[PDB]
């Protein structure tokens, strides 16, 4: 069992440390360590072998050090595109290997985004058959957090609200979704449907109508 | 190119047994140790075990021994993991990842350089559902600053994954596949959204071309404006 921190944070241009340790209530000879990077939805990625060694194109700013149970990977001149886990790995001389925890590193500083909301209607194939979902996409938001609220005209609707957590996008900003499930005759008995996001306390709110 | 190619993900019953296929190209086969490695939603990585496919040889983690195996088939550069009497807690992406080796030594290291693309596998009683797929058409209403946004409603499928690709995978400037939402009903849906020039609207044509391997099913549906 090998410990990691589950989070780490430095500003642009920085160094950070991520410390990979045995818990020692066990005795387990460690031997080689290896890290690896892994961005949201991807294969993990091999950074480090041997304790200190880089593969080909793996950028210098990754270093990594070994001191009796505990290992390290020092991340130098810290960039955006840090942000990810990272997981320490070693082998054993019982020709076994463990993983560490995971670390999730972020870059501090980043400014306040304002999220994208595109609301889609229901589609004439989906309303044939006999069904209705209004989507509300939002992207590109930071940080990540909003909040999502449905309307049928004015009034607020909670019934046949599906809505995802947010998730990291590749350029470290974020997205959700939500979705209004609603029958062919509510969709057309009202003069338009709306989905309102807040986000860091101010609202970017879309309508769309059958009319 | 050295490359791990998976087998496809798959549903699985509690207490039944899985077997994921990794076949190895562009080096050969018996001069590497491969891993298998899962990670399960939201959770990190795990090692399983390894094989030999030189000697046949393997380990496994003693979370799994007795039950779980790895088998390779030299003649088609395979390596298999099957796991036996299916927990919901084995609901994990597998993967392959090739062992580089030691420098100074033939044997293994546990730094792992190629890996495979991952085998999605759920461990539920819930039977598979192909999603349906509905257009969701550009408009004046998804238009702003000279770019129009189309795509895809991929809609209450079991289990997860799809995959979504716009034009056969030709196009991926601007496309965002968004993270599915687990409906209350047990079922997900998820959008695949295309951001292109509104000027392309009249000569380009896009199609979603959406896979659910789970279910064996893939479905391409033409977007165009209403």
């Known amino acids: 069992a090998l410990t990691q921190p589950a989070s780490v944070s430095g500003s642009p241009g920085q160094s950070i440390t991520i410390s990979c340790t045995r818990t020692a209530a066990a005795v387990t000879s460690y031997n080689y360590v290896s890290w690896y990077q892994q961005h949201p939805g991807k294969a993990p990625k091999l950074l480090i072998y041997?304790?200190?060694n880089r593969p080909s194109g793996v950028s210098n700013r990754f270093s990594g050090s070994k001191s009796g149970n505990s290992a390290s990977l020092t991340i130098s001149g810290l960039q955006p595109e840090d942000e990810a886990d990272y997981y320490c790995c070693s082998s054993t001389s019982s020709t076994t290997v463990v993983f560490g925890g995971g670390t999730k590193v972020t870059v501090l500083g980043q400014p306040k985004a304002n999220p994208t909301v595109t609301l889609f209607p229901p589609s004439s194939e989906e309303l044939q058959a006999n069904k209705a979902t209004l989507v509300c996409l939002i992207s590109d938001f930071y940080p990540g957090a909003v909040t999502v609220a449905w309307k049928a005209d004015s009034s607020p609707v909670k019934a046949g609200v599906e809505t995802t957590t947010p998730s990291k996008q590749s350029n470290n900003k974020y997205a959700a979704s939500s979705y209004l499930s609603l029958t062919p005759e509510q969709w057309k008995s009202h003069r338009s449907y709306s989905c309102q996001v807040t986000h860091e306390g101010s609202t970017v709110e879309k309508t769309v109508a059958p009319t | 190119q050295v490359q791990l190619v998976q087998s496809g993900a798959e549903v699985k019953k509690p207490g039944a047994s899985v077997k994921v296929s990794c076949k190895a190209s562009?080096?050969?086969?018996?001069?590497?140790?491969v891993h298998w490695v899962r990670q399960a939603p939201g959770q990190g990585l795990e090692w399983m075990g390894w094989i030999n496919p030189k000697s046949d040889g393997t380990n496994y983690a003693q979370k799994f021994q007795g039950r779980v195996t790895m088998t390779r088939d030299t003649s088609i550069s395979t390596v298999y993991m099957e796991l036996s009497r299916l927990r919901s807690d084995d609901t994990a992406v597998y993967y392959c990842?090739?062992?580089?080796?030691?420098?100074?030594?033939?044997?293994?290291?546990?730094?792992?350089?190629?890996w495979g693309q991952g085998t999605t596998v759920t461990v539920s009683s819930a039977s598979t559902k192909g999603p349906s797929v509905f257009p969701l058409a550009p408009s004046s209403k998804s238009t702003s600053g000279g770019t129009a946004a189309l795509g895809c409603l991929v809609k209450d499928y079991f289990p997860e994954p799809v995959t979504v690709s716009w034009n056969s995978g030709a196009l991926t400037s601007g496309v965002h596949t968004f993270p599915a939402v687990l409906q209350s009903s047990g079922l997900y849906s998820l959008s695949s959204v295309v951001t292109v020039p509104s000027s392309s609207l009249g000569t380009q044509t896009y199609i979603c071309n959406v896979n659910h391997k789970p279910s064996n099913t893939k479905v391409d549906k033409k977007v165009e404006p209403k």
């Open positions: 041997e304790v200190s």
């Open positions: 562009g080096y050969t086969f018996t001069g590497n140790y």
């Open positions: 990842a090739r062992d580089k080796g030691l420098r100074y030594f033939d044997w293994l290291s546990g730094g792992m350089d190629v």
